[PDB]
Design a protein around this ligand. Structure first.
Ligand SMILES: Nc1ncnc2c1ncn2[C@@H]1O[C@H](CSCC[C@H](N)C(=O)O)[C@@H](O)[C@H]1O
Ligand SMILES: [Zn+2]
Ligand SMILES: [Zn+2]
Ligand SMILES: [Zn+2]
Length: 232
């Protein structure tokens, strides 16, 4: 029923009042890039102004950085035209955070989303395996209901329980329309959501959770798909 746009989360005090009434999810620390709890160029021919003006993608699907799921930096041959700097430029798709029937809050497209469209980066606190297991028990002790863990690399798990952005609201489906992709940005790995098919406006954005924390009971899955696994 209730819904809200990405920008409603910039203002903290207005947010806590909307949350106090149930028109926005509960407060968390909004951040722009991953926070660690313990701390070359491509070959694309630069585009001329004509081909720029008439609609040519700079650093298209044949870009060497894009192929290795590396993002270009400042020094790219196309400079400002580079379409391969989506994480750094926060070129996120238009999405809204909405109340679902029983999964809690969720993400839905506010515009049509073509296939293999960048949706959002999944930000949060990065933990090693020791910190991760520490919080799994802190969160079972606090009877948390929603969990916000995302596998990044060996000895790196992303935890958006406390700090993150609106990507933390994407819910599970056994028949998803999104996936995670790991991208290198300045020598460092981040993960983001990408649509795996055309998502029509209004439709809820979902991906297929593949995380193992386990023990503390299992959660039933309300995705409502034809072939639902039954649980998360
Ligand atoms: N398909 C599904 N069925 C039941 N619960 C789901 C679900 N997908 C996501 N969830 C819930 O959402 C949590 C993941 S975090 C996703 C955002 C969450 N819906 C929220 O309001 O904050 C899970 O721990 C689970 O509680
Ligand atoms: Zn390139
Ligand atoms: Zn580039
Ligand atoms: Zn399901």
């Amino acid at each position: 029923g209730p819904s809200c746009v990405m920008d409603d989360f910039r203002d903290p005090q207005r947010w806590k009042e909307c949350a106090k009434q149930g028109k926005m999810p509960c407060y968390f620390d909004l951040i722009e890039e991953n926070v660690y709890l313990t701390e070359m160029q491509c070959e694309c021919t630069p585009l001329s102004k004509d081909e720029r003006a008439q609609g040519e993608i700079a650093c298209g699907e044949d870009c060497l950085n894009r192929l290795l799921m590396i993002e270009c930096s400042s020094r790219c041959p196309n400079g400002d035209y580079c379409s391969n700097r989506r994480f750094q430029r926060k070129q996120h798709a238009d999405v809204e955070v909405i109340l679902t029937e029983k999964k809690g809050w969720g993400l839905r497209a506010a515009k049509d989303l073509p296939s293999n469209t960048f949706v959002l980066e999944y930000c949060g606190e990065v933990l090693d395996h020791k910190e991760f297991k520490a919080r799994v028990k802190e969160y079972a002790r606090n009877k948390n209901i929603h969990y916000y863990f995302m596998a990044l690399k060996n000895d790196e798990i992303i935890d958006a329980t406390q700090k993150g952005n609106c990507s933390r609201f994407m819910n599970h489906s056994c028949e998803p329309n999104c996936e995670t992709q790991k991208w290198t940005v300045n020598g460092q790995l981040r993960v983001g959501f990408f649509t795996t098919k055309l998502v029509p406006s209004g439709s809820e954005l979902t991906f297929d959770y593949q995380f193992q924390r386990y023990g503390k009971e299992a959660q039933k899955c309300f995705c409502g798909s034809a072939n639902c696994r039954g649980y998360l």
